[PDB]
Design a protein around this ligand. Structure first.
Ligand code: HEM
Ligand code: HEM
Ligand SMILES: N=C(Nc1cccc(COC[C@@H]2C[C@H](OCc3cccc(NC(=N)c4cccs4)c3)CN2)c1)c1cccs1
Ligand SMILES: N=C(Nc1cccc(COC[C@@H]2C[C@H](OCc3cccc(NC(=N)c4cccs4)c3)CN2)c1)c1cccs1
Ligand SMILES: C[C@H](O)[C@H](O)[C@H]1CNc2nc(N)[nH]c(=O)c2N1
Ligand SMILES: C[C@H](O)[C@H](O)[C@H]1CNc2nc(N)[nH]c(=O)c2N1
Ligand SMILES: [Zn+2]
Lengths: 407, 411
C-alpha cells in the first residue's frame, strides 16, 4: 500500500502514497500490463464535486471550515436544482493547474504552477472562440519568450451543445495526398486538411501551410478562421555547422498548443480547453521530422551528409538524427524562441518528482512517454522507476468531433 | 477475450488470445501500472498442477495430446511426486522447457532465434569443479571462434532449497571493479561488490580496468569455490573507430560472449537456480549502457573531449554526438574481428517480424516495451511505435536474490 520507486543511477528511493487517492483506471490488471497502449447524471456528479472541493479547501488550509461546508452545501443545492454547477474562478484556476500537475505523460510539469488561465466560459459563438484563441496565441507567444496558458470554453451541458476546436493543435501544417501517391506537407493532418478544404479553405498546397482554425460553438457547425500570420511565430531551421541545412526548406512553429483534449474538473467537462507551453527539441527534430509517417526526412539529410547508407550498422540514421536535433535547438535559440533540450527537460523532471514526492507524497508518471525518443539512457529519466496512475482533475482524450458531430 | 495491439507507424493491428494462458502476476492493478519497476521450497501441493500444465503444453506441442504416451507420462510424474516430492524432466522436456522460457521472455528483443538453442544437460554435475568444467565447455561451444551460437547449461534443480547450485557471477564473463581510497573506481563500477567478494575468497586481483573475473561456483549448497576461465577461451574485441584514429588510444575493449548466470529457470514447477545462458550482443548494450551509463565506464566526457565538441551547453547535444560515435565504433570493431553482433536497427526490425509471426502461429507474444525499445534512437526503431502486451507465461526465466545474501556459510 506504500510503494517504493528507485532511481538505478543514484539509488535514491522515494515512497509513494499519493496513488491511494487514485480514482480512475489504468487499463492494466494483475494478469496483463497495458503500459505501452496509446489509449487504454445528478447521482454521479455530487461525489465528483465533493472530492474536488475537499482537495481544493485542503490546499488552502481550510479543510473543515464553514467556508468549506457552505460551498459544499451551495454546490449540492445547485446540482439538485440545475443538475450541474459552476466553478468559482479560484476553483477553475486550481482545477486547471492540477490537471497539468496530474498529467502523467508530461515531462514539463516542474512548471505546473505557473499557468495563465483564460476564462472563456462567457463565450457563445465561433467568432468569439476565434477572438479568445487569437488572444491566447499572442499572450503565450509573447514575441518568442513563451508563457504557458490555457483558455477554457463553456462546460458540456446535455452534450448536444459542446464547444470544440476541431484542430488537434491551434497551429499545425497542412497535409495533401498527391497524384504522385506520395504526401506533401504533414501526413498526420491529411484528413483534417481535407475537412478544411471540404469546408472551403483556400489551400496554398505547400509543404508548410498553417492550417485554418475550425471552431465549433454550442454544438453548431464549425467555421473556418485564418489566424493572423503576424501571430504565428515560425522558425527557419538551419545548422550551426552545415551550410546546406537551410537548403532543405525546413521550418517549424514556436508555439505548441493542444486543442483536442477534454479537461475534467470536479465532474465537469470542458471539451474545448486549448493549452500551450513550449517545445522540447526532440518533439520537432525526432518525431515531427524523422518519424516515417511524418516529414520523414532522414534519407535526404543523410544523403546531404554523404553517409554510408548501405548498411544499418553504419548508424547513418542515428548520425543524421543527432544533427537534425542540434539544428532545431540552434535555430530556436538563435531566433530567441523558447525551447528546451531533452537533457535539461528530463533533469528538471527528476527535480520535480523529488519535490512532489516530498510535498504531495508522489507523482504519477508514465515512463513510456517521459523517456525522450532519442538518447533514452543518457537522460536521467531512463533510470528512474515511475508509478503511473490517474488523478483528477485531468486532461483526457476525446473522440475527433467529425466522427461525432451531427451536421 | 481478445486484445488488440496497433503499430502506429504501419496501422497493422494484431489480436492477442495467448494472454489467457498467463498465470503469474504482473505487479499492475486496475489502479496502478508498474510497468517501469525493474522488479515488481515447493510442496507436492502446488507441484502436480504445475507439472500437469507443463506436460499438457509439451504433449500438445508434439501433437500427441491425450495420447497414451501423454497419459502414462502424467501418471508416472504423479507417482514420482507423491513418492519423492519432486520429479525429473526427460531430456526432451528439458530442451522444450528451456527454449520456451526464452520464447516467453517478454524483455528479450532477440527471441526470433528462440528455437535455435543448444541445451547442455548438466544435471549429473555434483561439485564446483564439475561446474567449472561444464561452464568452460559452454563458453568454448558458444564462442565458436567469433561465430556465436546460443546455448544454455542446466545444473541440477532445487530440492530442499538448502542444496542449491548457483553461479555467483552475474555473467560468466565480466570485468572487475575496484573502489579506490580517493573514492574513484577502477574497472567496472557495477561489479565492485562482487569483485570484493572474489578478493576475500582469495582471488589475486591484477587491479586493471578490464580484468576478467574468476568464476565463483556453488555446488549442492556448499560454499562456493574460485576458478579462472582459461584466457584462451575468453574472446575479446579491442574497440576502434573507422574514421577516428585516436579512438583506439582510449584503451577500450569488451568481451564477445554475453552469458547471464544469475537467473532462475522454471519448468513445470521445477526450479533450476544455475542455468547460465548465452547468445550475442546487440551493440547498444556495450556502446550505450556499459560504456556510457554514468554508473558504468562513463566515457562520454573523454570521448566528446577528443572529438572537440562544444561541451559548454547540453543543447549542443555533445553527449548525443559522442554516443553515436561510440556505438559505431563498437559495431565496427566486432564486425572487423568477425565476432557476431547485431545493431539495434536490425534487431528491432527482426523482433517486429518475430512478433507478428508469433501472433499468427501462437495467438500472442508477451513483450515489455520499456525493455524492448533500445536506449538510444528509440523512435527511429520500429518497436517504439509498436503497442505491446506484457504478461507472464511459464516456462520462464526469473530473478533470484544474490546468493551472498542468502547463503549459510559452512567455513
Ligand atoms: C511548459 C513547457 C512544457 C513542456 C516542455 C512540456 C513537455 C511535454 C512533452 C514533450 C509531452 C510529450 C508530447 C508528445 O510526445 O506528443 C507532454 C505531454 C503532455 N503535457 Fe506537457 N509540457 C509543457 C507544458 C504543458 C502544459 C502547459 C500542459 C497543460 C496545462 C501540459 C499537459 C501535457 C499533457 C496532457 C500531455 C500528454 C498528452 C497526451 O497524452 O497525448 N504540458 N508535455
Ligand atoms: C541470440 C541473441 C540474443 C540477443 C541479441 C538478445 C538481446 C537481448 C537484449 C538486448 C536484452 C536486454 C538486456 C539488457 O538490457 O540488460 C535481452 C534480455 C533478455 N534475453 Fe535476450 N537476446 C538473445 C538471446 C537470448 C537467449 C539465448 C536467452 C535465454 C535462453 C535470452 C533471454 C533473455 C532474458 C531472460 C532477458 C531479460 C533479462 C532481465 O530481465 O534482466 N536471450 N535479450
Ligand atoms: N510541448 C508540447 N508538446 C505536446 C504536449 C502534449 C501533446 C502534444 C501533441 O500530441 C498529441 C498527439 C496525439 C496522438 O494521439 C494519437 C491518436 C490518433 C487518433 C486518435 C486519438 N485519440 C482520439 N481522439 C480518440 C479516438 C477514439 C477514442 S479517443 C489519438 C499522440 N500525441 C504535444 C506542448 C503542447 C501544449 C503544452 S506543452
Ligand atoms: N545479449 C544479451 N544481453 C543480455 C541479456 C539479458 C540480461 C543481460 C544483463 O542483465 C544484467 C542487467 C542487470 C539488471 O538487473 C538489475 C538488478 C540489480 C541488482 C539486483 C538484481 N536482482 C537481484 N539479484 C535481486 C534483488 C532482490 C530480489 S532479486 C537486479 C538487468 N540487466 C544481458 C544476452 C545474454 C545472454 C543471452 S543474450
Ligand atoms: C506504442 C507506443 O506506446 C507509442 O509509440 C508511444 C511511445 N511513447 C511515446 N512517448 C511520447 N512522449 N510521445 C508519443 O507519441 C509516444 N508514443
Ligand atoms: C527504471 C527502468 O525501468 C530501468 O531503468 C530499465 C528501463 N529499460 C531497460 N531496458 C533494458 N533493455 N535494459 C535495462 O537495464 C533497462 N532499465
Ligand atoms: Zn501496467
Amino acid at each position: 500500500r506504500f510503494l517504493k520507486v528507485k532511481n538505478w543511477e543514484t539509488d535514491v528511493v522515494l515512497t509513494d502514497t499519493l496513488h491511494l487517492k487514485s480514482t480512475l483506471e489504468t487499463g492494466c490488471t494483475e494478469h496483463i500490463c497495458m503500459g505501452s497502449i496509446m489509449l487504454p447524471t445528478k447521482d454521479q456528479l455530487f461525489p465528483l464535486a465533493k472530492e474536488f472541493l475537499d482537495q481544493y479547501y485542503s490546499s488552502i488550509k481550510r479543510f473543515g471550515s464553514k467556508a468549506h461546508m457552505d460551498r459544499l452545501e451551495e454546490v449540492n443545492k445547485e446540482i439538485e436544482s440545475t443538475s450541474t454547477y459552476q466553478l468559482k474562478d479560484t476553483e477553475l484556476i486550481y482545477g486547471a493547474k492540477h490537471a497539468w500537475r496530474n498529467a502523467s505523460r508530461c515531462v514539463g510539469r516542474i512548471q505546473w504552477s505557473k499557468l495563465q488561465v483564460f476564462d472563456a466560459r462567457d463565450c457563445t459563438t465561433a467568432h468569439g472562440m476565434f477572438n479568445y484563441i487569437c488572444n491566447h496565441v499572442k499572450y503565450a507567444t509573447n514575441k518568442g519568450n513563451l508563457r504557458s496558458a490555457i483558455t477554457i470554453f463553456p462546460q458540456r451541458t446535455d452534450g448536444k451543445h459542446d464547444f470544440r476546436v476541431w484542430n488537434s493543435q491551434l497551429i499545425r501544417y497542412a497535409g495533401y495526398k498527391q497524384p504522385d501517391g506520395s504526401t506533401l506537407g504533414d501526413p498526420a493532418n491529411v484528413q483534417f486538411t481535407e475537412i478544411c478544404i471540404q469546408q472551403g479553405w483556400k489551400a496554398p498546397r505547400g509543404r508548410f501551410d498553417v492550417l485554418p482554425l475550425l471552431l465549433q460553438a454550442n454544438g453548431n457547425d464549425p467555421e473556418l478562421f485564418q489566424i493572423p500570420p503576424e501571430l504565428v511565430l515560425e522558425v527557419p531551421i538551419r545548422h550551426p555547422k552545415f551550410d546546406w541545412f537551410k537548403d532543405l526548406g525546413l521550418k517549424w512553429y514556436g508555439l505548441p498548443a493542444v486543442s483536442n483534449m477534454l479537461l475534467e474538473i470536479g465532474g465537469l467537462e470542458f471539451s474545448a480547453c486549448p493549452f500551450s507551453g513550449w517545445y522540447m527539441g526532440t518533439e520537432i527534430g525526432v518525431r515531427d521530422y524523422c518519424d516515417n509517417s511524418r516529414y520523414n526526412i532522414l534519407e535526404e539529410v543523410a544523403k546531404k551528409m554523404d553517409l554510408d547508407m548501405r548498411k544499418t550498422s553504419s548508424l547513418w540514421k542515428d548520425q543524421a538524427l543527432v544533427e537534425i536535433n542540434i539544428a532545431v535547438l540552434y535555430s530556436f535559440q538563435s531566433d530567441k524562441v523558447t525551447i528546451v533540450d531533452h537533457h535539461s527537460a528530463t533533469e528538471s523532471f527528476i527535480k520535480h518528482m523529488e519535490n512532489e514526492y516530498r510535498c504531495r507524497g508522489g507523482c504519477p508518471a508514465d515512463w513510456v512517454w517521459i523517456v525522450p525518443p532519442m538518447s533514452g539512457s543518457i537522460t536521467p529519466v531512463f533510470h528512474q522507476e515511475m508509478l503511473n496512475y490517474r488523478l483528477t482533475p485531468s486532461f483526457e482524450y476525446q473522440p475527433d468531433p467529425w466522427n461525432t458531430h451531427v451536421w
